[PDB]
Amino acid sequence: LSNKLTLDKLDVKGKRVVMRVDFNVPMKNNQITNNQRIKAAVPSIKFCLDNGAKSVVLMSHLGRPDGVPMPDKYSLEPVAVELKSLLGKDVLFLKDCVGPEVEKACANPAAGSVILLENLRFHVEEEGKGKDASGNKVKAEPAKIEAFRASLSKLGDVYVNDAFGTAHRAHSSMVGVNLPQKAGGFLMKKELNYFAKALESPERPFLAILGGAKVADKIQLINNMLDKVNEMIIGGGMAFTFLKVLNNMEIGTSLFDEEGAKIVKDLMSKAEKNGVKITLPVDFVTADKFDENAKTGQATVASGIPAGWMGLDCGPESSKKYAEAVTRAKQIVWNGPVGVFEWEAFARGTKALMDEVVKATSRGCITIIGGEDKVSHVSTGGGASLELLEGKVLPGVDALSNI
Numbered sequence: 001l002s003n004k005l006t007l008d009k010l011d012v013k014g015k016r017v018v019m020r021v022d023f024n025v026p027m028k029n030n031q032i033t034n035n036q037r038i039k040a041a042v043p044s045i046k047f048c049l050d051n052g053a054k055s056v057v058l059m060s061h062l063g064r065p066d067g068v069p070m071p072d073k074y075s076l077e078p079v080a081v082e083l084k085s086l087l088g089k090d091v092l093f094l095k096d097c098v099g100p101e102v103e104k105a106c107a108n109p110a111a112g113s114v115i116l117l118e119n120l121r122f123h124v125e126e127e128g129k130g131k132d133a134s135g136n137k138v139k140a141e142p143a144k145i146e147a148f149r150a151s152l153s154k155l156g157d158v159y160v161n162d163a164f165g166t167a168h169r170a171h172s173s174m175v176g177v178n179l180p181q182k183a184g185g186f187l188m189k190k191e192l193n194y195f196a197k198a199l200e201s202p203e204r205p206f207l208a209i210l211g212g213a214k215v216a217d218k219i220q221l222i223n224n225m226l227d228k229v230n231e232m233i234i235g236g237g238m239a240f241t242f243l244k245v246l247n248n249m250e251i252g253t254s255l256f257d258e259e260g261a262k263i264v265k266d267l268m269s270k271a272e273k274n275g276v277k278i279t280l281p282v283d284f285v286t287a288d289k290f291d292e293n294a295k296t297g298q299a300t301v302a303s304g305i306p307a308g309w310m311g312l313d314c315g316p317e318s319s320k321k322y323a324e325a326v327t328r329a330k331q332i333v334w335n336g337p338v339g340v341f342e343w344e345a346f347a348r349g350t351k352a353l354m355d356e357v358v359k360a361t362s363r364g365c366i367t368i369i370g371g372e373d374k375v376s377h378v379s380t381g382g383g384a385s386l387e388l389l390e391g392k393v394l395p396g397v398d399a400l401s402n403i
């Protein structure tokens, strides 16, 4: 991921720039509740403008239209308005993102123009599949996917992807823009830079913190990271499958993966061959049901979790052992929380861990959190950086130009 063209190396003087951005801002009744994403794209836009771009055409998606036009539910129009204010420059909103009219509008704009197109996911051709009003799944048509892609391509002379968080999908706006230079925007640059260091030449010790719910769909994540790390914390719902299998721990109604259980000793067996020191939790915050407002308890591996109750967070002794690993690390990658941090009662392990990760950063650790000024890098894509850590090829990253 080191050798990708980035916007700062791209010539844009007098060029029309088609820029895929992340403008999926949280919305309430069509009013933007957090403009943080729009803000994050401004440096890229401005760089283009300050460097004499003829136009920047912004294409993005919002919400969940699933390939049906929903102008009154998932329009990008409000975003154009916020952007005009963020930039101090007019932004031209277009009511579609492809077709003859949009093409004429973009063919030779007034120099310095900024254009936001309507939501890409109004077209089944963006994602290559969608639904209808009755919610019956539909397929896109090959011929029409290709035409969509040719129309997006008509809108600029160079292309910028600053949408890392979509870069794991082979979508028209990710892989379909056929233009001679395809660069990463400034957000995408930071992602490639941080993840490339971590995967290629991490500082050492390299600690991976892996949490979340399910073991089953994290087998490649763990496997690949076992090729690379020196230490790994296993937390979140995952840990109960490991502790049941490895230690015969009573887990109560804690998440258990019957399929995952059968490979636990396989993974530990790989950790051992490789010299990766595994830190599992040793105590827990328990809950009488899966609910924000459940009664809370405490349990250790020795006592086990009681009948009826589940571990939704690690305890104080687990936080210390976690901290011991964090204290050793010179490079940390963290993917997935270590308890149900959405619920205040089950959020202490995660907050405490984050406090340790923040101090580590102060002392000079390189710290990467998956999908904020106190860590080295917060990733802008959750699914994408997970597939990265799995060692997969990301279509939108792979499509960018080399050198």
Ligand SMILES: Nc1ncnc2c1ncn2[C@@H]1O[C@H](COP(=O)(O)OP(=O)(O)O)[C@@H](O)[C@H]1O
Pocket: 211, 212, 213, 214, 235, 236, 237, 238, 255, 311, 312, 313, 336, 337, 338, 339, 340, 341, 342, 382
């Ligand atoms: N001990 C636990 N038991 C059940 N769920 C948990 C536990 N710890 C964390 N989780 C939940 O798992 C979710 C993250 O799981 P993950 O596999 O990363 O799914 P996602 O696909 O949402 O990222 C979080 O929302 C968190 O609340």
